[PDB]
């Protein structure tokens, strides 16, 4: 069509740019002593994220620091290498940008844009739940981001509020590609977060990008309800609920929202929205999105429903507090062969 043929052309250009960067990734674009450390923003099994200041410019960044020995111990080499490769190759308004990367004797470093508004998770637990217009604004961003990622044959596999950052203008930034995979056909890994796993992952089937559309259904439900559709004390009980095709909706959900959710939280793959012959357009054209101006969202011209409080550059009030630990760099090169391509 008109709008239709524009989308086709846009995604073909996007795939060409992605593939060029995928095939020749950038390496070694800064070094540690170019930055001052300010504060730990989060910690993980094999690294931490810190707010840093670039000494030359004064610009702030979020620096992910991965301990190479821990990455090896935890069998995360391929996931780490893959995350950096994806991040340096993608380009979309709602994906966090990689600004620099480098490595040293002990660590790998990914220097990303700092997103001062913090995780959606905190805002959702604080506020309780989002009204449907508010939830719809964020959902539209994810729909567009998945359309983009899926056109590159990337499955995301870890959608949840914990992984969605809110920027200064109120828009989403997706940050963590540690489980993303380039998959034209099917894949089989059991991975993700219990509450957000699609049934076909739990049932140990081969699965495809349709798991991201299931997870969108879970996200929209949690945003609009304040709690996820399937929960329990233990993950095993969560899985039993997920693979039942049973869901209950709060009485305040609109009829349109319930109908959309029935079609995303669809255990039957042949029936799940996003996985049918019209693909993502079954979602974009759904009655719940009738008021959504998809191009205006993409162009970030829609007034956001919530703007986080920002007291300047380097303000960290929207992140938790963590014990500050030294960044030791060993005199001995650790795990050099394993991380050659980083």
């Amino acid at each position: 069509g008109s709008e239709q043929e524009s989308v086709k052309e846009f995604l073909a250009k996007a795939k060409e740019e992605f593939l060029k960067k995928w095939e020749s990734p950038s390496q070694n674009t800064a070094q540690l002593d170019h930055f001052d450390r300010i504060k730990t923003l989060g910690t993980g099994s094999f690294g931490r994220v810190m707010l840093v200041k670039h000494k030359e410019t004064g610009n702030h960044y979020a620096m992910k620091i991965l301990d190479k020995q821990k990455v090896v111990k935890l069998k995360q080499i391929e996931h780490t290498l893959n995350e950096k490769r994806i991040l340096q190759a993608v380009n979309f308004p709602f994906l966090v940008k990689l600004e620099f990367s480098f490595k040293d004797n002990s660590n790998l470093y990914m220097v990303m844009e700092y997103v001062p508004g913090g995780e959606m998770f905190s805002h959702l637990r604080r506020i309780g739940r989002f009204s449907e217009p508010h939830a719809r604004f964020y959902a539209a961003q994810i729909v567009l981001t998945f359309e983009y990622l899926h056109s590159l044959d990337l499955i995301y596999r870890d959608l949840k509020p914990e992984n969605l950052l809110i920027d200064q203008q109120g828009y989403i930034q997706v940050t963590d590609f540690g489980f993303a995979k380039r998959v034209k056909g099917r894949t089989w890994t059991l991975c993700g977060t219990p509450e957000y796993l699609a049934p076909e992952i739990i049932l140990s089937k081969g699965y495809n990008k349709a798991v991201d559309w299931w997870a969108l259904g879970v996200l929209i439900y949690e945003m609009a309800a304040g709690y996820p559709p399937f929960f329990a004390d233990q993950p095993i009980q969560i899985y039993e609920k997920i693979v039942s095709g049973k869901v209950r909706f709060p009485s305040h959900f609109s009829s349109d929202l319930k109908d959309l959710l029935r079609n995303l939280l669809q255990v039957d793959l042949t029936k799940r929205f996003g996985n049918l012959k019209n693909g993502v357009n079954d979602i974009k054209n759904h009655k719940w999105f009738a008021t959504t101006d998809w191009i205006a969202i993409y162009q970030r011209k829609v007034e956001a429903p919530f703007i986080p409080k920002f007291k300047g550059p380097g303000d960290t009030s929207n992140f938790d507090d963590y014990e500050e630990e030294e960044i030791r760099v060993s005199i001995n090169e650790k795990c050099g062969k394993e991380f050659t391509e980083f």
């Binding site: 540690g178 977060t193 796993l197 996820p228 004390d233």
Partner: peptide
């Protein structure tokens, strides 16, 4: 209520991957 059941689940904090 469903909300009370969610609080009783103990899974109201940040959730790790599997």
């Amino acid at each position: 209520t469903t909300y009370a059941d969610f609080i009783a689940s103990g899974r109201t904090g940040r959730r790790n991957a599997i």
